């Protein structure tokens, strides 16, 4: 088409990322803005508020973010990288919406000669005046930096030698690297700061008078400090797994000291929080302290409150955590209500008001890889009734979750609610299928299906939380293919060990037996054998299923090989499935096998593609149901299908006969099969005409068969299968087709106009649009690196010109090639 017409239809943009960012390294939180901050090893900074409020930034040096400090009240933040550099970020409103940008940077450097092991920043303390940064270092010296306009203030430095001179003789036995471990401001006096050193010396320092007001020397090595809200109590934690309480009123002794998980030797308690409540029952949250021999491998955060104590246990390393408190600066009590934990593989939020401390559902930042993703499947425009029933069944399985509204709700989302409901289904290694709301900026878990059901298999107070599982139990359960009929609520899922399940949406629970049917694909091949995966043992007798997608029939391929293709026709109530050996058709109404076809006689018979079509196979006048299969060797099989009417659906059996066998002479694997109607419009989905008679295919004009191989596109006329058009992609451009999907491209110049075209993902990671029906290449975009074999394998298209691919094991990148779609965040955040 003309280039002016291309610009109304096609335009490539990567718009948003969905999921849990790879390898987090720092956590920050602003209690005034109610906004979460996450830094990564790659130098990324990511901010989150209410759903729709999110920002991303990148440090120019791609070094790990180690600390994030959102300035009190202000719309600013200071990050620290592992190269010891500090950076000042801000949220300025440009164009009525907020945006994140880096203002300045600063590397604290000592006089030439001083080792870097001395100027290494340990603690960053933003002063309540919002004008000064106090910087503790491994040498024991506290430096002061002005804000904004980064400038060190050498006259305000608090050195270790200046502190030790104000102290008695027995408190002066310093180490070479005093190592500032704590650096805090008095909660009720901006003139006093606490400095804590590794060897156990803690001082309270009068900034204006340059003198020590208070000090103690703990018996154990110091790890961290917490200053009670009123400033009259200090809690320290130590390298032997103990913590002490200290009064603040000179040179005192501990009020209390204990190793919470003794008497065994314990690992350090590395962070501790002491939080008051109006009810007079304080919270004690601390990280670590595990018995070294039996639990040293554990990633724990313990919570003590009102005689109750739980050691929350996470399956990945704790990167950082925070506790949301009802209190603002003025409040007398802290009153915690949520514990937010950033682990290396997931975010976890705990409700601290509700007894039992239940988890909070995530609206975003979901660990898509809590079981490894093995396939995906996108469905656009969901019927509202089906959508509500999915969401309903999701709530029923999430009853153990807290009812607390999402607390990290800062900012204001400026984007209207999505007009269209999109679903992204993910298949996983453990046999689960998750239903994600892919409509807008936030990818939210709506419902989870577990297919493992149909097959056969206190001190410290550990409680396992989170969802990430690092262990691979049974790879046979892995979901390979997914087909959801958004009209009938039927669902077909296919697995790694030849298992094919057809399921149906149900509002209520059910107790039923899953009917098992074997599909032997080597029936006409004696002497064969199967090396490897034994079939999954199915549950005999009835099984109880919660509300959701409930399986009623299991088709077990023999041999139980990886199911390599799947198609479901919800109107004819048939399911087709392929393996490396052959393919077969199954009547899931009668729960009987219609036919089975082996493909190993002229891998090569490897069935890549399956496609139902009501089109012309023999005569130009009558159009019958049909199934099409494409193989790795360029072969296309077509089967005429006799489907009884509604009344006779259970009385007479469905009949099939091989009507066509087309061979592509270039002999490349068939990746896509499609039929266009008389107006060259692709045939509609099953039950789409039943729900919309305007989509009834044109039977007046001649139908055309589109076959896409890895090397070529080809259009034949039906029923003769006479060649009409072709595009030799690999010959022309040197690229190979990885996958291809039909996509409707609407015009941005005409409100209600659009054309169907082919979205094509190549083995070079490119994304091409090939026109229909003429097979002319329209646009080619760079998207995924050609070396990114996992990202290319994970890429999935939408029906209307969007797409998703995995940039990491745990998050998608959303791209759009259509001018009608641009799902990006737009939000406002102010103080
Ligand atoms: Cl463009």
UniProtKB/Swiss-Prot annotation:
Intracellular or extracellular location(s) = Cytoplasm
The record's Gene Ontology cellular component field reads: adherens junction; cortical actin cytoskeleton; cytoplasm; cytosol; intracellular membrane-bounded organelle; plasma membrane
WD repeat ranges are: 25-58, 65-106, 121-158, 182-216, 222-254, 268-310, 318-352, 374-450, 480-555, 564-602, 607-663, 672-724, 729-782, 796-819
A biological process (GO) of this protein is: multicellular organism growth
User: Is the keyword Cytoplasm in the record?
Assistant: yes
Which InterPro entries does the record cross-reference, listed alphabetically?
A: Lethal2_giant, LLGL2, WD40/YVTN_repeat-like_dom_sf, WD40_repeat_dom_sf, WD40_rpt
What the entry says about post-translational processing?
Phosphorylation is enhanced during cell polarization induced by calcium. Phosphorylation may occur during the cell-cell contact-induced cell polarization and may contribute to the segregation of LLGL2 from the PRKCI/aPKC and PARD6B/Par-6 complex.
Subunit: Interacts with GPSM2/LGN, PRKCI/aPKC and PARD6B/Par-6. The complex is enhanced during mitosis. Interacts with DCAF1.
Q: Which PANTHER family match?
A: LETHAL 2 GIANT LARVAE PROTEIN, LLGL SCRIBBLE CELL POLARITY COMPLEX COMPONENT 2
Q: Which family does it belong to?
A: Belongs to the WD repeat L(2)GL family.
Its protein name is: LLGL scribble cell polarity complex component 2
Species name for this entry? Homo sapiens (Human)
The organism's lineage is:
Eukaryota, Metazoa, Chordata, Craniata, Vertebrata
Recorded name of the encoding gene:
LLGL2
């Amino acid at each position: 088409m003309r280039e002016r017409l291309k610009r109304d239809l096609f335009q490539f943009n990567k718009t948003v990322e969905h999921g849990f960012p790879h390898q987090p390294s720092a956590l920050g939180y602003s209690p005034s803005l109610r906004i979460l901050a996450i830094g990564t090893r790659s130098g990324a900074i990511k901010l989150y508020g209410a759903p729709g409020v999110e920002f991303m930034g990148l440090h120019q040096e791609n070094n790990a973010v180690t600390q994030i400090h959102l300035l009190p009240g202000q719309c600013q933040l200071v990050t620290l990288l592992d190269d010891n550099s500090l950076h000042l970020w801000s949220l300025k409103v440009k164009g009525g919406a907020s945006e994140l940008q880096e203002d300045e940077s600063f590397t604290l450097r000592g006089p030439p000669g001083a080792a870097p092991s001395a100027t290494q920043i340990t603690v960053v303390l933003p002063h309540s005046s919002c004008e000064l940064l106090y910087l503790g270092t491994e040498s024991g010296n506290v430096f002061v930096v002005q804000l904004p306009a980064f400038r060190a203030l050498e006259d305000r430095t608090i050195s270790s030698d200046a502190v030790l001179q104000r102290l008695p003789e027995e408190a002066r036995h310093r180490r070479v690297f005093e190592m500032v471990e704590a650096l805090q401001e008095h909660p009720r006096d901006p003139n006093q700061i606490l400095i804590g050193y590794s060897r156990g010396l803690v001082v309270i320092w009068d900034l204006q008078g340059s003198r020590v007001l208070y000090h103690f020397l703990s018996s154990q090595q110091l790890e961290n400090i917490w200053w009670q809200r009123d400033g009259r109590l200090l809690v320290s934690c130590h390298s032997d797994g103990s913590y002490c309480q200290w009064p603040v009123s000179q040179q005192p002794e501990p009020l209390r000291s204990l190793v919470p998980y003794g008497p065994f030797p314990c690992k350090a308690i590395t962070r501790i929080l002491w939080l008051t409540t109006r009810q007079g029952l304080p919270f004690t949250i601390f990280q670590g302290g595990m018995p070294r021999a039996s639990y040293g491998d554990r990633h724990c955060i313990s919570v003590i409150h009102d005689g109750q104590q739980t050691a929350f246990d996470f399956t990945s390393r704790v990167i950082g955590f925070t506790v949301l408190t009802e209190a603002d600066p003025a409040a007398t009590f802290d009153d915690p209500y949520a514990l937010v934990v950033l682990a290396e593989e997931e975010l976890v939020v705990i409700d601290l008001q509700t007894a039992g401390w239940p988890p909070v559902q995530l609206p975003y930042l979901a660990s898509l890889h809590c079981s490894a993703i093995t396939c995906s499947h996108h469905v656009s425009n969901i019927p509202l009734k089906l959508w509500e029933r999915i969401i309903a069944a999701g709530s029923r399985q999430n009853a153990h979750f807290s009812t607390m509204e999402w607390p990290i709700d800062g900012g204001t989302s400026l984007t209207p609610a999505p007009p269209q409901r999109d679903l992204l289904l993910t298949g996983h290694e453990d046999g689960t299928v998750r239903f994600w709301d892919a409509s807008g900026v936030c990818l939210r878990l709506l419902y989870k299906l577990s297919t493992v059901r149909v097959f056969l298999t206190e001190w410290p107070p550990l409680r396992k939380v989170g969802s990430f599982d690092p262990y691979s139990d049974d790879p046979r359960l892995g979901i390979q293919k997914i087909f959801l009929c958004k009209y009938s609520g039927y669902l077909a899922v296919a697995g790694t060990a030849g298992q094919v399940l057809v399921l149906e949406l149900n509002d209520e629970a059910a107790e039923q037996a899953v009917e098992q049917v074997e599909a032997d694909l080597l029936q006409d091949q004696e002497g064969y054998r199967w090396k490897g995966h034994e079939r999954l043992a199915a549950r005999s007798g009835p099984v109880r299923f919660e509300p959701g997608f409930q399986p009623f029939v299991l088709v077990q391929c023999q041999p139980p090989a990886v199911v390599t293709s799947l198609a479901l026709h919800s109107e004819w109530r048939l399911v087709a499935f392929g393996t490396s050996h052959g393919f077969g058709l199954f009547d899931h109404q009668q729960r009987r096998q219609v036919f089975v076809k082996c493909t190993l006689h002229p891998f090569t018979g490897f069935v890549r593609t399956l496609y139902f079509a009501d089109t012309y196979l023999k005569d130009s006048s009558r159009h019958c149901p049909s199934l099409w299969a494409g193989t790795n060797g360029g072969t296309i099989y077509a089967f005429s299908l006799r489907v009884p009417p509604a009344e006779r659906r259970m009385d007479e059996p469905v009949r099939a006969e091989q009507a066509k066998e087309i061979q592509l002479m270039h002999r490349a694997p068939v990746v896509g099969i499609l039929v266009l109607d008389g107006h060259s419009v692709p045939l509609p989905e099953p039950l789409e005409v039943a729900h919309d008679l305007s989509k009834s295919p044109d039977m007046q004009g001649s139908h055309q068969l589109l076959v896409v191989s890895e090397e070529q596109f080809k259009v034949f006329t039906l029923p003769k299968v006479s060649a009409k058009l072709k595009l030799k992609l690999t010959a022309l451009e040197g690229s190979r087709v990885r996958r291809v999907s039909v996509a409707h491209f609407g015009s941005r110049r005409a409100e209600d106009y659009g054309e169907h075209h082919l979205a094509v993902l190549t083995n070079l990671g490119d994304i091409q649009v090939v026109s229909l029906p003429l097979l002319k290449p329209q646009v080619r975009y760079s998207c995924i690196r050609r070396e990114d074999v996992s990202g290319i394998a994970s890429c999935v298209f939408t029906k209307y010109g969007q797409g998703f691919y995995l940039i990491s094991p745990s998050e998608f990148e959303r791209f759009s090639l259509s001018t009608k779609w641009l799902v990006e965040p737009r939000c406002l955040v102010d103080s």
